[PDB]
Design a protein around this ligand. Structure first.
Ligand SMILES: *[C@H](O)[C@H](Cc1ccc[nH]c1=O)NC(=O)[C@H](CC(C)C)NC(=O)c1cc2ccccc2[nH]1
Ligand SMILES: *[C@H](O)[C@H](Cc1ccc[nH]c1=O)NC(=O)[C@H](CC(C)C)NC(=O)c1cc2ccccc2[nH]1
Lengths: 300, 300
């Protein structure tokens, strides 16, 4: 019983975290088969990061300027390529510990586990959600780049995120494992905006559902409302609009608890209009939107 | 940049999680060398759990009534012993993946990572704090028992917690790895109270310090106060008393930030007396006490 932000077990992923060094810059890479993936700004000096031409910078680099370390062992780089914002260093030895894996591009509102790494060594695990503005709210210091975000589905690690950047607001931006950024970000030391952060309404409603399943029911109201009317009030509060697909996703949760989605949307509406009056739901004095319906079900 | 509840990487611990079955009861065990550790109520039926005599129950059991599974492989139980509330099943094969490890008894206010397991298979990782009333606020369903709590210090896994029980309030109680409960709990299906839950004041102050380091400063006040006067107001709010050792622990954090402990205690005092006025610190509308000073430093 109880509900907590949980991350996937990190073991399969720890075995793929290497250290990549190019000159004075050192970052984490991800060693799957005979290929190492890291952020391409590893090939940058502090001067270059202001206005980098990555084709030109890399053309200057040769396989031997890239140091890949796995614990103590040194991998021999026999190839180098640039896919979008990601450098692919081909190496001699396939990773014996390559787990079964896939590269996925998650959509906004979905969550993933992050293994935060410094120097190719894991330091800690936490769960993040792709915000709607394509940022994440993590714990990344300098050296965390190349740290990866993943889901574990059965035996298969779905890699979805590699960390590249912190924004001026302190949020974090990164790419998929094909090197395409989430959001309108570029790997350059320039001022960049994520824009208006909005609340994943479907997740807040899964969370309210987790609360009811764990015994918190005070927020429940006898009123009900309409989808469009809920969305009318929601958009005022920069809440992402609910859809009938959203409703179908919350379906097995509205079933389990005997509370209809439109009944919950009315109870959420009162909480947005009337505040929380100093109470707490599931130990939070604010509304949580970093759990998906799937997250809640897997826990409950 | 940023502050998040982080758990240790779980890889060394995943490799020690086995499944223990005795009759119709199945639980998780922890396989270190030629010894498996699990909660002893594995030897109980649903009738026995009401008023169990564990000596008598186990005397009826023989090595062959205990099924230990590691993935598919079956370990052969060649020994059985009861240490406090923990059953030690001696086995034939030493665990090849035994990490370097130690058994520690944590003190209240300290935090640890939990790997939550079902059927000897890991499902997720989160960070917990030993509450002052010796309970924990986790996410444990039936079958989670024998799931373990740990810290990773250098190369060495310090096992500190094994889960046994949920209380009527929904909090969780368990033992150290020598089988001694944290708190006044017994492994019996009876109504049991943890008592008054109090707030780890030293942790809240480390958290306020993490907030300042990450840029949240609004709560900071020009006032200051005295230790004893702070403790006067604190005890009203069921906050654990601060001590000069506590102060020395928060020392490197009061140094880094240029704010004295007694200056922070005054700023905490205003927040207890004047509320938070609807603002947020580090994304929370409540005061967080599940980070120790060490946790904050390791992250920052
Ligand atoms: C990668 O290791 C590092 C991640 C990092 C750095 C500092 C704090 N937190 C972190 O997570 N990422 C960077 O250093 C990147 C470098 C590449 C070329 C994008 N740059 C920044 O993160 C950065 C640059 C910048 C300019 C102005 C405001 C903020 C800002 N952040
Ligand atoms: C161990 O797998 C299981 C853990 C569990 C069970 C249900 C919900 N959440 C959980 O974490 N622990 C138990 O089943 C134990 C059994 C032993 C003998 C202690 N019992 C309880 O957890 C329990 C018994 C009881 C009686 C009255 C109120 C509450 C209560 N909880």
């Amino acid at each position: 019983s109880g509900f907590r932000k949980m991350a996937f077990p990190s073991g399969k992923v720890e075995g793929c975290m290497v250290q990549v060094t190019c000159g004075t810059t050192t970052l984490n890479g991800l060693w799957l088969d005979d290929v190492v993936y890291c952020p391409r700004h590893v090939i940058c000096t502090s001067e270059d990061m202001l206005n980098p031409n990555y084709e030109d910078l890399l053309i200057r680099k040769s396989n031997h300027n890239f140091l890949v370390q796995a614990g103590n062992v040194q991998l021999r780089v026999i190839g180098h390529s640039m896919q979008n914002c990601v450098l692919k260093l081909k190496v001699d030895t396939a990773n014996p510990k390559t787990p079964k894996y896939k590269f996925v591009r998650i959509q906004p509102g979905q969550t993933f586990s992050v293994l935060a790494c410094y120097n190719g060594s894991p330091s800690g695990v936490y769960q993040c959600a792709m915000r709607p503005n394509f940022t994440i709210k993590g714990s990344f210091l300098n050296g965390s780049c190349g740290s990866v975000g993943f889901n574990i589905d059965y035996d298969c690690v779905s890699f979805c995120y590699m960390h590249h950047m912190e924004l001026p607001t302190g949020v974090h931006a990164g790419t998929d494992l094909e090197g395409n950024f989430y959001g309108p970000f570029v790997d350059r030391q320039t001022a960049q905006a994520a824009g208006t952060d909005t609340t994943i309404t479907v997740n807040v409603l899964a969370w309210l559902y987790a609360a009811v399943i764990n015994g918190d029911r005070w927020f429940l109201n006898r009123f009900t409302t309409t989808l469009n009317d809920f969305n009318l009030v929601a958009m005022k509060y920069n809440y992402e609009p609910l859809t009938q697909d959203h409703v179908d996703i919350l379906g097995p949760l509205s079933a389990q608890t005997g509370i209809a989605v439109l009944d919950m949307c009315a109870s959420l509406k009162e909480l947005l209009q009337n505040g929380m009056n100093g109470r707490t739901i599931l130990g939070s004095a604010l509304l949580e939107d970093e759990f998906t319906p799937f997250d809640v079900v897997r826990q409950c």
